[PDB]
Amino acid sequence: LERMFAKPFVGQLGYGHRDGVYAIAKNYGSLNKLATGSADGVIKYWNMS
């Protein structure tokens, strides 16, 4: 049963970065918040919920 129920992928965050992701940081105090960066120079703040 473990093998048929193994469905690890839940989704993806938004539409992603323009370039490759190279930095991910967590808000160690808040459970559902996540900050990402890319080689594009872009940084985003996510609401994972």
Q: Residues in the site for other proteins, rule: CB under 8 A?
A: 1-2, 4-24, 26, 28, 31, 34, 36, 38, 46, 48
Instruction: Read off the amino acid at residue 28.
Output: Y
Taking a C-beta distance cutoff of 8 angstroms, is the pair 30, 45 a contact?
no
**Token representation of residue 12:** 């993806």
Least Å from the CB of residue 1 to other proteins: 6
Least Å from the CB of residue 9 to other proteins: 6
CA atoms within 13 A on the CB side of 49: 4
Least Å from the CB of residue 48 to other proteins: 7
